[PDB]
Design a protein around this ligand. Structure first.
Ligand SMILES: CCCOc1ccc(S(=O)(=O)N2CCN(C)CC2)cc1-c1nc2c(c(=O)[nH]1)CCC2
Ligand SMILES: [Mg+2]
Ligand SMILES: [Zn+2]
Length: 297
């Protein structure tokens, strides 16, 4: 089979260092990478976050899990596909390392963010595709993604959480679930005020469980949207993909400016306040606003 073949190549490979793979960079890009290569980067992300060790993940199982995740994104979807999930994970990784967020969180939280970033759009069909009620929003889409995530975590050969104790397992699933549900922009809009207001007053505090949970949610949105922060030539390219999905052009630049003002700037400003080293995200986002604004006329 084409697929057990893919599993063999992947399990046999030597995983280059994080530095060699450029996965520590906020300006990372996946355009020139093969599927196999994105899988290796992903293993390096688990490894250098020290998650394979702390939680005793078997190599064959992690490899199989990554391939399952990859397999359950649809390639025919121009933007909401595996590369988007892979990029969201890479940005999470870079915020934890380069952005120095790692030290602010527990191992279990880090574990759950990485998994959530990779799984958060599982089985997406495209924004233009959409039982009972369904009456009041409620993140139906994200519930589906999380269910997909859960089913893969429980598939034979795919159980990367088997090394956790039952109590750790339950805590981790809860975090994964909240994390995936947090990628619903509506929820993000609903909750950001609290977070901004708190940073305003220099009252923000990670020791408060309520605030921790709020921060993790903000963190997910920041990664989920991070394409908006990439170097111009790359951002233009990703914008291309999004437009293809949204519509299957003269108004696109102003749309981009609207999106950056409405959603992105404040979030990346807030994240910078929490950790100054996440500044490149904010900086990259500002430069892109300037560029799209110039096209907008
Ligand atoms: C480039 C084509 C047009 O792109 C957009 C147009 C509108 C918006 S939006 O007004 O903030 N918005 C549209 C309605 N959604 C449910 C939420 C997002 C975002 C985007 C948009 N979203 C994303 C990116 C982007 O470049 N544009 C990259 C990360 C996600
Ligand atoms: Mg989504
Ligand atoms: Zn997403």
């Amino acid at each position: 089979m084409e697929e057990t073949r893919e599993l063999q190549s992947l399990a046999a490979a030597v995983v280059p260092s994080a530095q060699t793979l450029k996965i520590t960079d906020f300006s990372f890009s996946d355009f020139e990478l093969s599927d196999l290569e994105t899988a290796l980067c992903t293993i390096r992300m688990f490894t250098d976050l020290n998650l394979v060790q702390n939680f005793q993940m078997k190599h064959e199982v992690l490899c199989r899990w990554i391939l399952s995740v990859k397999k359950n994104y649809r390639k025919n979807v121009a933007y909401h596909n595996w590369r988007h999930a892979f990029n969201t994970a890479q940005c999470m990784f870079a915020a934890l390392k380069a952005g120095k967020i790692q030290n602010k969180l527990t191992d279990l939280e880090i574990l759950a963010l990485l998994i959530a970033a990779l799984s958060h759009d599982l089985d997406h069909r495209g924004v233009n595709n959409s039982p009972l009620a369904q009456l009041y929003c409620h993140s139906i889409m994200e519930h589906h993604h999380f269910d997909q995530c859960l089913m893969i975590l429980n598939s034979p050969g795919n159980q990367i959480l088997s090394g956790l104790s039952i109590e750790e397992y339950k805590t981790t699933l809860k975090i994964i679930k909240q994390a995936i549900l947090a990628t619903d922009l509506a929820l993000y809009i609903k909750r950001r005020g609290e977070f901004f207001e708190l940073i305003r007053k220099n009252q923000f505090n990670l020791e408060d469980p309520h605030q921790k949970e709020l921060f993790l949610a903000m963190l997910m949105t920041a990664c989920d949207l991070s394409a908006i922060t990439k170097p111009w030539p790359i951002q233009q390219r990703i914008a291309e993909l999004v437009a293809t999905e949204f519509f299957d052009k003269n108004k696109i630049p102003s749309m981009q400016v609207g999106f950056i003002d409405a959603i992105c700037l404040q979030l990346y400003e807030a994240l910078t306040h929490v950790s100054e080293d996440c500044f490149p995200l904010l900086d990259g986002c500002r430069k892109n606003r300037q560029k799209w604004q110039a096209l907008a006329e």
